């Protein structure tokens, strides 16, 4: 290819590859994969893409875009790197730069979505107007495609329509302006919007480049934080203050929208699994909700500072 579009500010690479075929009258879905990569077996993925580097060689004559900038600033990889572990973070890039695809989701053992859960194509009613007025084009954005919360962090709730990534595995689709974007009455859960606003700044923050606290470090930090202001009895978990904080700040309908039911009656609950010694990777939702419940006046980056320092 001779004219590969430069990615806009804060967009996914999937929409960039789509606009790389919208701009030159290529309508057969096979030819786009034939020209961009050269293989007819390459897949289409939203968040954590692979085969990167071939997408950077096209932009090579521009000295700015490289592999590291593409992966950190233009994917959904920032959400998984700091929390899981340092060595896995450092090896994910070398596993992802090359042609391997199956190992990417396996090694980062959190992407067991099974059936495509909310992988329907999503957009926002108000953001598209701003993108139109300031650019003249519409595209997919990383703010919309948060893995769990189906809410735009600034405002409102995303507009689901009926299609899926598994409907066509070998097709890159760009957003169509002539495809009608119809508004619906906004049904918003304010707690979910607040959580989205709280978790948004981590996506574009330089300090998340290398800071990943260790497993034992996580355990000591959580024990010390629980004992700082009295969330732990003498060698026993209180089980009451932890529940009443999260029920004060979060209601039950928010938790069922997040599919994160608490189980005080049942012994196996994720809240108790967090406070016990960690052995597997944990999602950002649990850490975020614990941070919000335990102390409400601290930012995500400085929370990671305090977690990692001690």
């Amino acid at each position: 290819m001779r004219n590969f579009p430069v990615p806009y500010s804060n967009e996914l690479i999937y929409s960039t590859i789509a606009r790389a075929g919208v701009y030159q009258g290529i309508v057969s879905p096979k030819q786009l994969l034939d020209e961009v990569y050269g293989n007819r077996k390459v897949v289409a993925t939203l968040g954590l893409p692979s085969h990167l580097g071939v997408i950077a060689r096209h932009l090579h004559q521009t000295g700015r875009y490289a592999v590291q900038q593409l992966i950190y600033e233009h994917t959904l990889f920032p959400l998984y790197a700091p929390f899981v572990g340092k060595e896995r973070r450092d090896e994910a890039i070398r596993l992802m730069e090359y042609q391997a695809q199956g190992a990417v989701h396996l090694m980062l053992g959190v992407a067991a979505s099974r059936v495509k859960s909310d992988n329907r194509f999503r957009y926002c009613p108000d953001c598209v107007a701003l993108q139109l007025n300031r650019y003249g084009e519409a595209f997919w954005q990383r703010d919309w495609y948060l893995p769990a919360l189906p809410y735009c962090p600034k405002h409102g709730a995303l507009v689901f329509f009926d299609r899926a990534v598994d409907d066509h595995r070998h097709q890159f689709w760009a957003l169509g302006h002539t495809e009608l974007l119809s508004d619906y009455p906004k049904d918003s859960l304010s707690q979910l919007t607040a959580l989205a606003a709280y978790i948004a700044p981590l996506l574009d923050a330089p300090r998340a480049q290398e800071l990943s606290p260790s497993l034992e470090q996580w355990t000591l930090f959580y024990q010390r934080l629980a004992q700082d202001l009295g969330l732990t009895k003498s060698k026993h978990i209180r089980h009451d203050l932890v529940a009443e904080r999260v029920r004060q700040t979060f209601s039950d309908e928010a938790l069922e929208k997040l599919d994160l039911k608490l189980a005080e009656n049942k012994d196996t609950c994720w809240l108790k699994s967090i406070f016990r010694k960690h052995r597997k990777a944990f999602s950002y939702l649990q850490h975020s909700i614990v941070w919000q419940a335990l102390l409400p006046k601290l930012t995500v980056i400085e929370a990671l500072q305090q977690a990692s320092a001690l």
């Binding site: 701009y23 932009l59 650019y135 003249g136």
Partner: protein, 394 residues
């Protein structure tokens, strides 16, 4: 294929204040310096006059390829081409979000197969058109290879990634078949850029309707400046329904798509245009401009005359030789140079090292016989007699 990095100017006109495309070109020049810039000649030097005969013969024969002189009209043509190639980028600005609309609409025409489909009514296109009709042998192609050689062809930007192509030139197929013009547009952007658009767009058997939209969208994939079409007379020789099809597609492209187009052809191709744009007519030069002999003829004859390579020659020119030239050639720009070169070649070969009128007459009547019948009509001057044949003034 001259890849050049772009460094911008600062234009004065407020309409061009933002574009990178129109601020990447070399500046337009005043008519005073433009006439001097175009002119080129030979190095000559007196050291060759006493060299061998064979070494002199090739230097004599190298006259017609390296000798250009600007006439009166070329200074108008350069200005008009500059204006018409600068006026086609104000509606495709990438900074203020205009190329994205002009390029997004072109996908819809590809999908449905109609060229009148539009998605954004705000997209406005500005373009111009011209035709350059002149008698054969008047040197109109070389004018469009020397005026349009100041602008470099492929310029590469770095803020964007667009590889702008400033000008492109195609030749219509001899049969005029409606598929080969589209198949030859992907064979000039194929060599001037070093790619393989032909394989991905031509081998896959598509209809003409979709192949016409593929052209109009690929031309806007880059920033095409000028699509000049040479040898337009072959369009009349196609099958039925094609004579008007690409006299409507080439005005659809100018009006809707927004790529400027200029057509160049012979006088016998004017009929299809008039079977139903600014018009510039080119005519062979004549000495008898109003009541006194023209200065251009004398100046050009002296400039060509000072390139002789004969050991014993007449430095000053005589008017009888000028009259012989004007009565044997009739002023068409091809005959004069070839006639002079042949005359001095025969003079060098014979042994008589000086050019005379008799030698000119003998060479003209012995070596240019396939050309005489048409020149008889030009020499006679009768309108009815000159009206026959083709490629003559009408």
């Amino acid at each position: 294929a001259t890849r050049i990095q772009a460094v911008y100017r600062d234009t004065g006109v407020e309409a061009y204040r933002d574009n990178p495309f129109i601020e990447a070109l070399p500046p337009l020049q005043e008519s005073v310096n433009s006439a001097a810039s175009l002119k080129s000649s030979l190095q000559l030097t007196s050291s060759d006059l006493q060299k061998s005969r064979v070494i002199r013969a090739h230097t004599i024969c190298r006259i017609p390829d390296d000798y250009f002189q600007p006439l009166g009209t070329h200074l108008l043509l350069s200005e008009r081409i500059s204006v018409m190639i600068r006026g086609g980028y104000v509606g495709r600005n990438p900074k203020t979000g205009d190329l994205q609309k002009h390029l997004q609409n072109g996908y819809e025409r590809v999908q449905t197969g109609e060229l009148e489909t539009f998605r954004f009514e705000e997209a406005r296109s500005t373009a111009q058109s011209l035709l350059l009709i002149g008698c054969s042998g008047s040197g109109k192609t070389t004018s469009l290879h020397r005026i349009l050689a100041t602008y470099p062809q492929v310029i590469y930007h770095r803020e964007l990634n667009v590889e702008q192509v400033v000008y492109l030139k195609i030749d219509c197929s001899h049969n005029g078949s409606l598929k080969e013009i589209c198949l030859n547009f992907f064979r000039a952007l194929d060599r001037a850029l070093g790619s393989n658009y032909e394989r991905r767009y031509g081998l896959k058997r598509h209809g003409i309707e979709t192949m016409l939209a593929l052209m109009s969208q690929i031309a806007n994939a880059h920033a095409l400046g000028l699509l000049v079409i040479d040898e337009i007379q072959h369009l009349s020789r196609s099958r039925s329904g094609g004579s008007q099809e690409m006299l409507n597609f080439f005005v659809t492209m100018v009006n809707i798509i927004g790529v400027p187009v200029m057509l160049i052809g012979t006088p016998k191709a004017r009929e299809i245009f008039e079977a139903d744009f600014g018009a510039i007519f080119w005519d062979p030069i004549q000495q008898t401009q109003r009541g006194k002999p023209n200065q251009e003829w004398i100046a050009f004859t002296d400039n060509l005359w000072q390139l002789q390579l004969l050991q014993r020659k007449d430095a000053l020119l005589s008017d009888e030789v000028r009259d012989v030239w004007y009565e044997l050639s009739q002023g068409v720009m091809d005959i004069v140079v070839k006639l002079f070169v042949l005359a001095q070649l025969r003079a060098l070969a014979l042994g008589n090292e000086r050019i005379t009128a008799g030698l000119l007459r003998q060479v003209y009547q012995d070596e240019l016989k396939p050309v005489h019948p048409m020149l008889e009509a030009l020499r006679s001057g009768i309108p009815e007699r000159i009206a026959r044949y083709s490629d003559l003034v009408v």
